[PDB]
Design an enzyme around this catalytic site. Structure first.
Site, short mmCIF file in Angstrom:
data_model
loop_
_atom_site.label_atom_id
_atom_site.label_comp_id
_atom_site.label_asym_id
_atom_site.label_seq_id
_atom_site.Cartn_x
_atom_site.Cartn_y
_atom_site.Cartn_z
N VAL A 54 0.85 -1.19 0.00
CA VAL A 54 0.00 0.00 0.00
C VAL A 54 0.89 1.25 0.00
CG1 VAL A 54 -2.09 -1.10 0.81
CG2 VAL A 54 -0.61 0.09 2.44
N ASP A 79 11.55 10.07 4.55
CA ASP A 79 11.08 8.65 4.60
C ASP A 79 11.89 7.71 3.67
OD1 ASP A 79 9.00 6.51 5.46
OD2 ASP A 79 8.08 6.88 3.46
N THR A 92 2.45 5.00 0.89
CA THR A 92 1.94 6.29 1.32
C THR A 92 0.51 6.59 0.86
OG1 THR A 92 4.23 7.09 1.36
CG2 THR A 92 2.50 8.75 1.71
CL LIG Z 1 3.12 -2.01 2.44
#
Ligand SMILES: [Cl-]
Ligand SMILES: N#Cc1c(O)c2c(-c3ccc(-c4ccccc4O)cc3)c(Cl)sc2[nH]c1=O
Ligand SMILES: Nc1ncnc2c1ncn2[C@@H]1O[C@H](COP(=O)(O)OP(=O)(O)O)[C@@H](O)[C@H]1O
Ligand SMILES: Nc1ncnc2c1ncn2[C@@H]1O[C@H](COP(=O)(O)O)[C@@H](O)[C@H]1O
Ligand SMILES: Nc1ncnc2c1ncn2[C@@H]1O[C@H](COP(=O)(O)O)[C@@H](O)[C@H]1O
Ligand SMILES: [Cl-]
Ligand SMILES: [Cl-]
Ligand SMILES: [Cl-]
Ligand SMILES: [Cl-]
Lengths: 279, 362, 159
Positions: B16, B131, B18
């Site tokens: 999935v 990040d 951000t």
């Molecule tokens: Cl993930």
């Protein structure tokens, strides 16, 4: 050569990170020259706050002019210079004889700038972006030529510069006298001569900031040699133009003295002359 | 009975991440595989991240670096936006360091060079990928690094700091965990530093199950260097894992490091700020406002300490903008800062500021 | 292309619409997400779902009630929905901070040319810096960038 100048834009010559000093015309003139010295700059643009635009450029010539115009003696203060604003002097120096501001754009060509320097008879020019209206950099002949020397990969035959009735000073010539020569003749350097016509030194407009720097300007009675105590470059007529162009840059000086067999003056060859020939 | 977008048949969800599901795409005719980020229009407007996606697309579309995941095309539909990208078989570098252990000096260096190269390209494009972790560093069949989650990224603007305290706390910089302002690249170095530690040791330098102790450790910049570590790489890690961003390695300091330089391929690579008043913050804001309007200047109070102000010129008859911001210098003193906003512009900016100062505190 | 997504459970879910002469095209399941993507001629289309032996519409999606009581979903496929930047554009419709150390890193203070300067960090551009008012005159200063070049301007202004 000239073809190169018509293509290349002014911006190309602006250095990656530079310093620029702007004086408000309301600033007292002594503070101005002292700031030139403190910041290590030969010329600063002038902003008229009421007019909301750059009106001109303050230079060492302005210093030479106030000094000569208003010097009385080593016993009295140059009251005028001591308490006079940049605006108050600019109006005196340029009364009915008015002059605006000569400036180039970064997107304008190198040719246009060289032409403008000669056209308006000036050695320092500012670059102003039309969009911002901000002064970016000040174009000096030494810089235009240094870029030309990086691109390049006799004197009697060509004949470039002023060779007759040259402005000169002697060993014992007072600074004041010399300042007056810089005024009436409208030249940048004065070769210093000995008992015989042979040249010992050269007092330039740039050696006149040392007075402001050392705060020794209240005594202009001093010989030109005494003034130069805070510290030659010659060329002949048999020497090639490219060898002379090389000698000037590998010494980064504004002009060479055209000398004789036994160190005697014969003419002059300036950066302004060389750049007119190559235009 | 196959779900298609482009001529790619949408397969298995990869992760999935951000801002939305990433699925595989296999081209109907060629068998070419792609990674497809799906952004639901109605979902991306629920979080006000529409601006973030717009920028993220704008950037990644013109990037082309061998160690950053390529964005092949963005397919918009009435309901959802699909970001088609290059697919890498090897997956997470994290899972690699889990399965196989720590990488040998030579292999870690290879990968660290590839990652840092990419990180550099980003910053060279005024983009800071906050990040940065081995979970976002994907591997291809030939073991090449591929930087991949630009969801938490941001632009670097002339004269501005960033605030968002984004990214995993293990990989997060001290100033980030402290929620302090930052330039941007320094936080990516601190992150690249912990990636290098993970590549060499197989573990995290700053890690504890107790969150407050983890956080003390990050800010005390103290980590363990096992015996097997080369003192030259220990030297490099010490320089990248500085708590003072001013004392921290810059990509230059890294390129110049003897450990980095080794076997490196050619394909990669007295003034005062404002005025400082000692009054109470809210008094300063009243003091500045009772001065700004005393000068007849139009403005807009953004934060309670940030003011965007405008001035109508009486001569050029052109509006000039500047923004004021109050910071805290000490336990005792505070300082008001003046920033120039682009529409002489510069001189008109100085004049604007000056007037305000002649009627203000230190 | 248009995305048709059913959000619920089911053993067999179909999409029937004007664009397929109301034929039961099946939707593939992922989780609780049944999808089929298809291109539609930018205009008006009516659709309905055949969720596990029951004819329904998506209640969240816009409907249309018929003169005959027929309740169908409706989709106005727009030109602006297909161009990414058009679509994104239509879609977009305390205590003080601590001073970042960066703003203390100057280029004027920190043989060579006095006119030349070190390259600045983007972060300190456009910020006003000033020297103490000495002898009733103010020195203001700021580094700005014109294209790929920088200019640090000093203004000697009296007060
Ligand atoms: Cl993930
Ligand atoms: N969460 C979430 C989410 C989504 O998952 C989607 C999909 C989607 C695409 C493909 C499949 C799919 C179906 C069968 C088998 C394999 C498959 O990959 C399922 C769903 C869209 Cl299209 S828009 C969208 N928006 C969301 O918010
Ligand atoms: N760009 C310019 N626009 C207007 N006046 C200028 C400009 N440059 C110089 N001046 C003026 O021309 C005169 C001579 O200056 P200049 O020869 O350029 O100085 P210097 O030889 O010290 O470099 C001075 O009165 C100066 O104010
Ligand atoms: N000392 C001097 N005497 C006479 N002419 C000079 C002297 N110095 C410069 N010139 C001339 O003045 C012009 C501009 O030169 P400069 O002011 O030195 O840049 C050129 O034509 C030079 O030849
Ligand atoms: N031809 C020359 N020979 C020796 N020194 C020179 C010459 N021309 C200028 N200078 C020196 O250059 C300085 C002045 O700078 P400028 O006006 O740029 O030439 C002074 O220190 C002068 O002594
Ligand atoms: Cl497969
Ligand atoms: Cl692969
Ligand atoms: Cl790990
Ligand atoms: Cl539903």
């Amino acid at each position: 050569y000239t073809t190169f100048m018509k293509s290349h834009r002014c911006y190309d010559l602006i250095p990656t990170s530079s310093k620029l000093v702007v004086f408000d015309t309301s600033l007292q003139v002594k503070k101005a020259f002292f700031a030139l010295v403190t910041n290590g700059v030969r010329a600063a643009p002038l902003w008229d706050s009421k007019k909301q635009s750059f009106v001109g450029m303050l230079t060492i010539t302005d210093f030479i002019n106030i000094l000569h115009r208003y010097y009385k003696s080593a016993l009295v203060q140059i009251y005028e210079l001591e308490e006079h604003k940049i605006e108050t002097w600019r109006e005196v120096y340029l009364q009915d004889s008015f002059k605006p501001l000569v400036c180039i754009s970064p997107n304008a060509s190198l040719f246009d700038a060289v032409s403008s320097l000669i056209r308006n008879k000036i050695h320092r020019l500012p670059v102003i972006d039309p969009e911002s209206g901000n002064t970016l950099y000040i174009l000096t002949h030494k810089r235009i030529l240094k870029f030309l020397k990086l691109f390049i990969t006799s004197l009697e035959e060509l004949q470039i510069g002023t060779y007759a009735n040259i402005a000169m000073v002697r060993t014992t010539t007072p600074v004041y006298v010399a300042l007056g020569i810089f005024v009436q003749h409208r030249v940048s350097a004065l070769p210093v001569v000995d008992e015989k016509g042979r040249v010992v030194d050269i007092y330039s407009k740039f050696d006149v900031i040392n007075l402001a720097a050392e705060k020794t300007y209240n005594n202009l009675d001093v010989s030109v040699t005494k003034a130069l105590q805070h510290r030659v470059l010659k060329c002949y007529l048999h020497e090639t133009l490219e060898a002379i162009i090389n000698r000037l840059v590998e010494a980064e000086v504004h002009r060479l003295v055209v000398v004789d067999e036994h160190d005697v003056v014969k003419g002059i060859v300036s950066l302004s002359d060389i750049l007119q020939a190559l235009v | 009975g196959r779900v298609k977008i482009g001529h790619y048949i949408l397969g298995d969800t990869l992760g999935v991440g951000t801002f939305g599901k990433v699925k595989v795409g296999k081209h109907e005719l060629t068998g070419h595989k792609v990674a497809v980020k799906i952004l639901n229009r109605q979902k991306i407007r629920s979080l006000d991240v529409v601006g973030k996606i717009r920028r993220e697309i704008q950037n990644l579309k013109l990037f082309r670096h061998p160690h950053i995941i390529k964005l092949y095309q963005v397919i918009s539909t009435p309901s959802d936006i699909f970001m088609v990208m290059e697919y890498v078989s090897g997956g997470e570098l994290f899972d690699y360091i889990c399965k196989n252990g720590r990488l040998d000096e030579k292999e870690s260096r290879r990968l660290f060079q590839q990652i840092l190269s990419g990180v550099d390209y980003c910053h060279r494009h005024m983009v800071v990928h906050r990040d940065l972790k081995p979970e976002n560093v994907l591997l291809d069949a030939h073991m090449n690094a591929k930087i991949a989650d630009f969801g938490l990224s941001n632009m670097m603007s002339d004269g501005e700091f960033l605030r968002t305290s984004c990214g995993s706390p293990n990989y997060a910089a001290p100033e980030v965990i402290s929620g302090r302002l930052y330039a941007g690249p320094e936080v990516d170095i601190w992150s690249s530093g912990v990636i290098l530690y993970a590549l060499l040791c197989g573990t995290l330098p700053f890690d504890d199950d107790h969150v407050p102790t983890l956080f003390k450790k990050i800010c005390d910049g103290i980590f363990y260097t096992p015996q097997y570590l080369n003192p030259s790489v220990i030297s490099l890690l010490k320089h990248m894992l500085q708590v003072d961003p001013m004392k921290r390695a810059t990509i230059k300091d890294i390129r110049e490091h003897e450990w980095f330089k080794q076997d490196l391929p050619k394909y990669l690579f007295k003034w005062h700020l404002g005025i400082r008043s000692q009054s109470r913050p809210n008094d300063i804001m009243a003091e500045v406002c009772r001065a700004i309007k005393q000068l007849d200047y139009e403005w807009k109070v953004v934060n309670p300490y940030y003011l965007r102000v405008r001035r109508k010129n009486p001569v050029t008859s052109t509006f000039s903008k500047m923004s004021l911001q109050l910071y805290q210098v000490d336990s005792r003193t505070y300082l008001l800062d003046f920033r120039s906003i682009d529409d002489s512009h510069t001189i008109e900016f100085f004049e604007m500021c000056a007037n305000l100062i002649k009627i203000l505190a230190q | 292309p248009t995305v048709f997504r059913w959000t619920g459970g089911g053993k067999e879910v179909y999409l029937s619409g004007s664009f397929n002469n109301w034929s039961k095209l099946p939707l593939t399941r992922d989780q609780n997400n049944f999808v089929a993507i298809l291109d539609l001629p930018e205009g008006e289309h009516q659709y309905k779902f055949f969720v596990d032996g029951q004819w329904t519409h998506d209640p969240s999606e816009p409907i249309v009630t018929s003169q005959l009581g027929t309740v169908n979903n409706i989709i106005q496929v727009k030109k602006t929905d297909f161009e990414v930047f058009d679509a994104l554009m239509v879609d977009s419709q305390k205590a003080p901070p601590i001073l970042p150390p960066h703003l203390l890193q100057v280029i004027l203070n920190k043989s060579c040319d006095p006119a030349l300067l070190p390259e600045p960090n983007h972060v300190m551009l456009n910020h006003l810096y000033a020297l103490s008012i000495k002898d009733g005159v103010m020195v203001l200063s700021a580094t700005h960038r014109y294209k790929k070049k920088y200019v640090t301007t000093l203004l000697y202004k009296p007060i």
